CSV table of N, CA and C in Angstrom, one decimal:
chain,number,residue,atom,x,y,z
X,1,UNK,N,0.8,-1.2,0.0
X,1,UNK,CA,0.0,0.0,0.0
X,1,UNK,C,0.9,1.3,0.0
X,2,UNK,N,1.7,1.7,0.7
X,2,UNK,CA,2.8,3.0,1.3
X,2,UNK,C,3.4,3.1,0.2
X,3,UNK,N,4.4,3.9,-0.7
X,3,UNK,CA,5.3,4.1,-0.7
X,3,UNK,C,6.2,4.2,0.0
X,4,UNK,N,7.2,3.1,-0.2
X,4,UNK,CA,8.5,2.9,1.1
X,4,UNK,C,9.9,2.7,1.0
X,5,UNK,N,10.4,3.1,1.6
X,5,UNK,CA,12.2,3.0,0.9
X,5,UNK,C,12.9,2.8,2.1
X,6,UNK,N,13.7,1.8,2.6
X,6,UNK,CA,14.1,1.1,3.7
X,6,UNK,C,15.7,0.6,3.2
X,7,UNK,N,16.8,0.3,4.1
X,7,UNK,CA,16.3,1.0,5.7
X,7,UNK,C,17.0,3.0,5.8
X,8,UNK,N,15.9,3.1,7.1
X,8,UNK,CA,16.2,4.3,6.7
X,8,UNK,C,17.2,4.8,7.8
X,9,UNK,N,18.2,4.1,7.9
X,9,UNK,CA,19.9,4.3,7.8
X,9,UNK,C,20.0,3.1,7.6
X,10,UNK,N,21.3,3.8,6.2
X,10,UNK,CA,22.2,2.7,5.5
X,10,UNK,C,23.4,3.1,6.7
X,11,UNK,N,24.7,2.2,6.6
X,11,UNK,CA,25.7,2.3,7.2
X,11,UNK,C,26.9,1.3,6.5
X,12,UNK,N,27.4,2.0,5.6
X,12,UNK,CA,28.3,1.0,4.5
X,12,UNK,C,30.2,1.6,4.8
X,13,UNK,N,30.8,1.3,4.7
X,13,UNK,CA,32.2,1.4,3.6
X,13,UNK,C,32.7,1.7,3.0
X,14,UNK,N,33.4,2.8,2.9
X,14,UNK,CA,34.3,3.2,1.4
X,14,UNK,C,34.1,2.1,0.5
X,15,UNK,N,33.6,2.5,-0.6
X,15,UNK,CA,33.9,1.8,-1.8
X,15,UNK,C,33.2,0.4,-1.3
X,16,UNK,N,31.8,0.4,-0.9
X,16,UNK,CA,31.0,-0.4,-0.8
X,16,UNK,C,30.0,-0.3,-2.1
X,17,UNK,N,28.9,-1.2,-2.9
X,17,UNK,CA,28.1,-0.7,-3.2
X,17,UNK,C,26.7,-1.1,-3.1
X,18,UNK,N,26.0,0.1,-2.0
X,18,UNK,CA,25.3,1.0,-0.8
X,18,UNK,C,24.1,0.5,-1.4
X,19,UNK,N,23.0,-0.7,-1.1
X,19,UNK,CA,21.8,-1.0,-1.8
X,19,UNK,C,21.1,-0.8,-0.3
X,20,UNK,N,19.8,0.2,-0.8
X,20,UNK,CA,18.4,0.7,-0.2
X,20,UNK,C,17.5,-0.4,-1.0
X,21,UNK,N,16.0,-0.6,-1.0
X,21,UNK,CA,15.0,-1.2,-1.0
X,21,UNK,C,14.0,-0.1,-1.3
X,22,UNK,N,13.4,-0.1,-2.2
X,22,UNK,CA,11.7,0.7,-2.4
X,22,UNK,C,10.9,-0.6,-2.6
X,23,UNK,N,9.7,0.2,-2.3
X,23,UNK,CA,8.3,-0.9,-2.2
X,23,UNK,C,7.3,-0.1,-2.8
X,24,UNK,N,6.4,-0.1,-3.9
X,24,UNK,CA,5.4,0.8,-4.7
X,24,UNK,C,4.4,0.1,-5.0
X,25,UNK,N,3.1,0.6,-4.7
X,25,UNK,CA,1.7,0.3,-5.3
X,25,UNK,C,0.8,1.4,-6.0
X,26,UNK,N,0.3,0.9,-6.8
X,26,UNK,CA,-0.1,1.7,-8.0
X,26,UNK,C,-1.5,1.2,-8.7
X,27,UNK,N,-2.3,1.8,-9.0
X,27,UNK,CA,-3.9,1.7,-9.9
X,27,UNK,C,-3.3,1.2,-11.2
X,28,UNK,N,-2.1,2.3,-11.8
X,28,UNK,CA,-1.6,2.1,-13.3
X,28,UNK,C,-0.8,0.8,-13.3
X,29,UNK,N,-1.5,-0.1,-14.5
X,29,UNK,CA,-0.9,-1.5,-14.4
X,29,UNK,C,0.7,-1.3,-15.0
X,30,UNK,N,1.2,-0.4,-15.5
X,30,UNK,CA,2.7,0.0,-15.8
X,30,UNK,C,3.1,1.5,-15.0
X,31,UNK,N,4.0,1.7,-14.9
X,31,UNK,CA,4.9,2.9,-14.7
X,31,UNK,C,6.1,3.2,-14.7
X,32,UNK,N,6.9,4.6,-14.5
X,32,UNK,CA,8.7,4.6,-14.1
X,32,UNK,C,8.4,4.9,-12.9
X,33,UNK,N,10.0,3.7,-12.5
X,33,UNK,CA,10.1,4.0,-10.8
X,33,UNK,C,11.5,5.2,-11.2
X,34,UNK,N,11.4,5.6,-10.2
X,34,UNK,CA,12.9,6.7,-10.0
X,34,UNK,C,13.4,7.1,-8.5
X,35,UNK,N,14.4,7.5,-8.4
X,35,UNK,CA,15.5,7.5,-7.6
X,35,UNK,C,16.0,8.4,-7.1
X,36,UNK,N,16.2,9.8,-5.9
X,36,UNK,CA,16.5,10.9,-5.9
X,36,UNK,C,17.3,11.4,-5.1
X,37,UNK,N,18.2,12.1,-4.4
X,37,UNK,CA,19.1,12.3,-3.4
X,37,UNK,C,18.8,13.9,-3.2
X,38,UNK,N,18.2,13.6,-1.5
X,38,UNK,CA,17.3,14.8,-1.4
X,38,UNK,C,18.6,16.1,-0.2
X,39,UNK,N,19.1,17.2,-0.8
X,39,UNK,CA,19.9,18.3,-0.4
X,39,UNK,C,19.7,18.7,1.1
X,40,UNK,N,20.7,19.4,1.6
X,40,UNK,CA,20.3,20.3,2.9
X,40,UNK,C,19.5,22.2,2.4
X,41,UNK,N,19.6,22.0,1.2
X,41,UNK,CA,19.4,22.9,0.9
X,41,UNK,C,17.6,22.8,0.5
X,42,UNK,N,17.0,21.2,0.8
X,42,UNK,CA,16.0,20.9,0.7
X,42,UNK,C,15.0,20.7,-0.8
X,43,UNK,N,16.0,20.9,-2.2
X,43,UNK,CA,16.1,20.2,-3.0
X,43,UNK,C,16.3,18.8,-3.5
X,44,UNK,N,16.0,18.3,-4.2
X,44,UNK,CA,16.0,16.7,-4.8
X,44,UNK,C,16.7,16.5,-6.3
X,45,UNK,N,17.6,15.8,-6.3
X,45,UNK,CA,18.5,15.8,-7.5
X,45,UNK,C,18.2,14.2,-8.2
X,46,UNK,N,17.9,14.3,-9.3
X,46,UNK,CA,17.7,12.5,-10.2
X,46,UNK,C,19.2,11.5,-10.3
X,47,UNK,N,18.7,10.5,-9.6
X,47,UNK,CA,19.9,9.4,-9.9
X,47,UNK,C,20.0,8.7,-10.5
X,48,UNK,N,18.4,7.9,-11.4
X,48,UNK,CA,18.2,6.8,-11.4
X,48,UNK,C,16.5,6.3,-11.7
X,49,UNK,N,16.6,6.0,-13.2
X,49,UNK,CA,14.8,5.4,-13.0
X,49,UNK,C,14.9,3.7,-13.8
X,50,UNK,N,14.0,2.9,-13.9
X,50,UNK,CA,13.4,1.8,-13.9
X,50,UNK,C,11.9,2.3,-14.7
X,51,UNK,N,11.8,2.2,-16.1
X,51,UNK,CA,12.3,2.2,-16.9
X,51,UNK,C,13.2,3.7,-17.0
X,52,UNK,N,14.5,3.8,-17.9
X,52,UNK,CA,15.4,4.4,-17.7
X,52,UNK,C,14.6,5.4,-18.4
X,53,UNK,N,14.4,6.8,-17.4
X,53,UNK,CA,13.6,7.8,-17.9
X,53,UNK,C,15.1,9.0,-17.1
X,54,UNK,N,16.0,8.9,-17.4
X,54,UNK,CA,17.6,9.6,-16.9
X,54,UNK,C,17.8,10.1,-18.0
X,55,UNK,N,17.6,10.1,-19.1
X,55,UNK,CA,17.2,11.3,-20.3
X,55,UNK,C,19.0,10.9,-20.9
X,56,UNK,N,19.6,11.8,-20.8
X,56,UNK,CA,21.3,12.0,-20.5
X,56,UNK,C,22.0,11.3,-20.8
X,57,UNK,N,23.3,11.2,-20.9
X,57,UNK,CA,24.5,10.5,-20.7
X,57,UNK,C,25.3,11.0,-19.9
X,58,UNK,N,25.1,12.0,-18.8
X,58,UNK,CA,25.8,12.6,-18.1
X,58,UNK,C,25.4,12.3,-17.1
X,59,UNK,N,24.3,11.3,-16.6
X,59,UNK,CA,23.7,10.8,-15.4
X,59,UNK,C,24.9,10.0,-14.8
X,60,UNK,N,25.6,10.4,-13.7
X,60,UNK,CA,26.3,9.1,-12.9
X,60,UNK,C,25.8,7.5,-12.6
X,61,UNK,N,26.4,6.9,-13.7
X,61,UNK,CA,25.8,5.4,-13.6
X,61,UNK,C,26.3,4.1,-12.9
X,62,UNK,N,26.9,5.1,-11.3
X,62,UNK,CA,26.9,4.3,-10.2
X,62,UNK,C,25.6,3.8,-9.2
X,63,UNK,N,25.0,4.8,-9.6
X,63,UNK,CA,23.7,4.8,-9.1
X,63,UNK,C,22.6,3.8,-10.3
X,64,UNK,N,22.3,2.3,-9.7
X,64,UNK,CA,21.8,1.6,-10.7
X,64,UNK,C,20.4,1.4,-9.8
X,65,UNK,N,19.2,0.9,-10.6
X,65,UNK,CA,18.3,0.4,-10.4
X,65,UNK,C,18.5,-1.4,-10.6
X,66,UNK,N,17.8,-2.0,-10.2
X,66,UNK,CA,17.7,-3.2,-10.2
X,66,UNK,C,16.1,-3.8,-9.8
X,67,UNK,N,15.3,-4.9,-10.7
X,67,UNK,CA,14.1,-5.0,-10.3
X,67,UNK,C,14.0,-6.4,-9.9
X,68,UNK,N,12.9,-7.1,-9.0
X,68,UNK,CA,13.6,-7.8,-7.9
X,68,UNK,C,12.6,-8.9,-8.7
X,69,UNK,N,12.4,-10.5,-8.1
X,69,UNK,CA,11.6,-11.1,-8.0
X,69,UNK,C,10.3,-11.3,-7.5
X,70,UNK,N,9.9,-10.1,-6.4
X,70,UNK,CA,8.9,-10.3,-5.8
X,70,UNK,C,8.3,-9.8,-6.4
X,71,UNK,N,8.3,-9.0,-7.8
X,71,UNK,CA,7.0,-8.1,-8.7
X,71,UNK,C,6.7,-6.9,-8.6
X,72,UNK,N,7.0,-6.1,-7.3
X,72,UNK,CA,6.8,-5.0,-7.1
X,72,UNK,C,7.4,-4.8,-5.7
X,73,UNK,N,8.8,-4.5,-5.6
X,73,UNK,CA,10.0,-4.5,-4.8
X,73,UNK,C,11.3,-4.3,-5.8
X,74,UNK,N,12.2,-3.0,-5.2
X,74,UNK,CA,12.9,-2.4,-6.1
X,74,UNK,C,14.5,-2.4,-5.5
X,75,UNK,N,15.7,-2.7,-5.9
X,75,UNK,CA,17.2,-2.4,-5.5
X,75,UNK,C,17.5,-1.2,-6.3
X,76,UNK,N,17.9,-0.4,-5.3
X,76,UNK,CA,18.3,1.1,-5.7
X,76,UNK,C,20.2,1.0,-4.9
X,77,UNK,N,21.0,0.7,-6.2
X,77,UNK,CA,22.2,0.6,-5.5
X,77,UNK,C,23.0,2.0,-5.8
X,78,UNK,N,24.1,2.3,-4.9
X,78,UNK,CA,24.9,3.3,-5.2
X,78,UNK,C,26.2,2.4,-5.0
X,79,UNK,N,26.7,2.0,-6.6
X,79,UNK,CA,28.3,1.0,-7.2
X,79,UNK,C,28.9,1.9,-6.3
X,80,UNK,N,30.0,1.8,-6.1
X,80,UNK,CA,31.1,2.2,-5.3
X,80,UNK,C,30.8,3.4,-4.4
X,81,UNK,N,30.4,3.6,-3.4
X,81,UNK,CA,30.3,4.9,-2.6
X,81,UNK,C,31.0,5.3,-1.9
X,82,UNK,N,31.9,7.0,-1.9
X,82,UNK,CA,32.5,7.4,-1.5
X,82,UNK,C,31.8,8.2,0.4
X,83,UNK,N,32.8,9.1,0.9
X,83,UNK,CA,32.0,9.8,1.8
X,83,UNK,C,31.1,10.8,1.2
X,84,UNK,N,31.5,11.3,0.3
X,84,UNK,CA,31.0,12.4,-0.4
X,84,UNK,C,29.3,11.8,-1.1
X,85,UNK,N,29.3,11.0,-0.5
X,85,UNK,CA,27.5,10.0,-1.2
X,85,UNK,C,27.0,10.0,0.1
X,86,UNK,N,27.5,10.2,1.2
X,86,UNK,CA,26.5,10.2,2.6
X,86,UNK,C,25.6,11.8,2.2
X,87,UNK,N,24.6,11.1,2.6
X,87,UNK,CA,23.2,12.4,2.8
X,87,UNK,C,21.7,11.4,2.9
X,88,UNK,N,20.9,12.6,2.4
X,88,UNK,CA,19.5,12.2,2.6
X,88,UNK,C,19.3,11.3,0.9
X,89,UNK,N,18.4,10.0,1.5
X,89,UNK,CA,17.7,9.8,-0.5
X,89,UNK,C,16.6,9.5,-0.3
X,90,UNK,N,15.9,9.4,-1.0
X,90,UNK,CA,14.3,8.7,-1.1
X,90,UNK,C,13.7,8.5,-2.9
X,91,UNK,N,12.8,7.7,-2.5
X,91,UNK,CA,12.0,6.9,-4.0
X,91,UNK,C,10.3,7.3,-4.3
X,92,UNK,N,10.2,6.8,-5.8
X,92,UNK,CA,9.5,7.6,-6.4
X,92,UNK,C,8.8,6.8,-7.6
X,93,UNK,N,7.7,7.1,-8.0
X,93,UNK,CA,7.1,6.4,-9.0
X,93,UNK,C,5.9,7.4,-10.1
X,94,UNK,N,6.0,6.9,-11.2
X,94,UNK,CA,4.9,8.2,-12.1
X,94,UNK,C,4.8,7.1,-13.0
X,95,UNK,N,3.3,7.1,-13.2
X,95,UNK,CA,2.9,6.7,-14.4
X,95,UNK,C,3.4,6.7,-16.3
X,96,UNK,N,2.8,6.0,-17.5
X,96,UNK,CA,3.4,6.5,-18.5
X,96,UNK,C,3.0,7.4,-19.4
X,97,UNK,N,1.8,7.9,-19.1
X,97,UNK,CA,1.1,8.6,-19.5
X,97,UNK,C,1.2,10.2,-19.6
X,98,UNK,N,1.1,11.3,-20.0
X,98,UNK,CA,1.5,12.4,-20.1
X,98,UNK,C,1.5,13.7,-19.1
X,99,UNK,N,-0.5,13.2,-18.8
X,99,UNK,CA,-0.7,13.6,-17.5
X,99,UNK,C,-0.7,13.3,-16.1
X,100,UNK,N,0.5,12.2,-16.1
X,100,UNK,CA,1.0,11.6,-14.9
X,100,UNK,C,1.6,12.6,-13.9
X,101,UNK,N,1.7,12.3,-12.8
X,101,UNK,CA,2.4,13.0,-11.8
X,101,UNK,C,3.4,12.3,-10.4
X,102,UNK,N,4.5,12.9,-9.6
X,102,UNK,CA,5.3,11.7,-9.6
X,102,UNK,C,5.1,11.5,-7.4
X,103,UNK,N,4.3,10.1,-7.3
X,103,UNK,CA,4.4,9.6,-6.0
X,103,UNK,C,4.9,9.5,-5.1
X,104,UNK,N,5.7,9.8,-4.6
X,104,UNK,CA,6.7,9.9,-3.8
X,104,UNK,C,6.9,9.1,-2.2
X,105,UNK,N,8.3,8.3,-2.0
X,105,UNK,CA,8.5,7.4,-0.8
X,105,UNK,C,9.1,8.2,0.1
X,106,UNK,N,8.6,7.5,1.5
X,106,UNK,CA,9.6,8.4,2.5
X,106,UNK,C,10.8,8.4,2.8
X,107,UNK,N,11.6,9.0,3.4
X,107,UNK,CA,13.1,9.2,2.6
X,107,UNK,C,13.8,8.9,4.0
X,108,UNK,N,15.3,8.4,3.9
X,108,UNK,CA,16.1,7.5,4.6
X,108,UNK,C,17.5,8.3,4.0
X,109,UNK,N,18.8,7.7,5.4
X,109,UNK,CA,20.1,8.4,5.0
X,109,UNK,C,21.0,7.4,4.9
X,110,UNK,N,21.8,7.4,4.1
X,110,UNK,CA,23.1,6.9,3.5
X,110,UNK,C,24.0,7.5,4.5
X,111,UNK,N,25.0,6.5,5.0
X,111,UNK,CA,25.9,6.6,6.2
X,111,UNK,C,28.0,5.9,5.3
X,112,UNK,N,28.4,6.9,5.1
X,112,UNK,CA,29.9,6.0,4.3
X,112,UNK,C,30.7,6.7,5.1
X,113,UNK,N,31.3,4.7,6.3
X,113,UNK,CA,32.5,5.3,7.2
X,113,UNK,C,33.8,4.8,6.4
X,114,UNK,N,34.8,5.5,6.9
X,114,UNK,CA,36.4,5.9,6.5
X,114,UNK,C,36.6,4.0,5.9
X,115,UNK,N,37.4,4.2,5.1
X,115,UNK,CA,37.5,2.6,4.2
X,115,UNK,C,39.0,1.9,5.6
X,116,UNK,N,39.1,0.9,6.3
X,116,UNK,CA,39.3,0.9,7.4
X,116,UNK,C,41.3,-0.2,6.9
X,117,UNK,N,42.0,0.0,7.9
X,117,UNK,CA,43.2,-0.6,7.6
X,117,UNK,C,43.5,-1.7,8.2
X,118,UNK,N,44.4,-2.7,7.3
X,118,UNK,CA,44.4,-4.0,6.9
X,118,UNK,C,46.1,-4.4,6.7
């Protein structure tokens, strides 16, 4: 039923790659899921959709989608994460249709401690 994006603290590794979980229900029997990393400045920036609606070739494609076996359960990974990838993210869904508008999950924080010595 919710829009949901779990857990909401990650706690990874230098040069881990940082998978979150979305969960989405929808009336429309298709849609794009998408992906966002939300600012202190309290803006929201695109990382990442399912189907690939990232327009660009300039989109950082560390940030991958992945769709799961359960049918409607999403992996939203960040490939290699630095510290500089700790902040706020959260997830999102919009129909394919024109006059769609986009759903939105509640939002959770990415945690990247110091890569540790060995």
């Amino acid at each position: 039923m919710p829009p949901t994006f779990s857990p909401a603290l990650l706690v990874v590794t230098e040069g881990d790659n940082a998978t979150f979980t979305c969960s989405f229900s929808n009336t429309s029997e298709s849609f794009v899921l998408n992906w966002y990393r939300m600012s202190p400045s309290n803006q929201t920036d695109k990382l990442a959709a399912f189907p690939e609606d990232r327009s660009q070739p300039g989109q950082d494609s560390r940030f991958r989608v992945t769709q799961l076996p359960n049918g409607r359960d999403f992996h939203m990974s960040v490939v290699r994460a630095r510290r500089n990838d700790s902040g706020t993210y959260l997830c999102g869904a919009i129909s394919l249709a024109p006059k769609a508008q986009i759903k939105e999950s509640l939002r959770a924080e990415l945690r990247v401690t110091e890569r540790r010595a060995e």
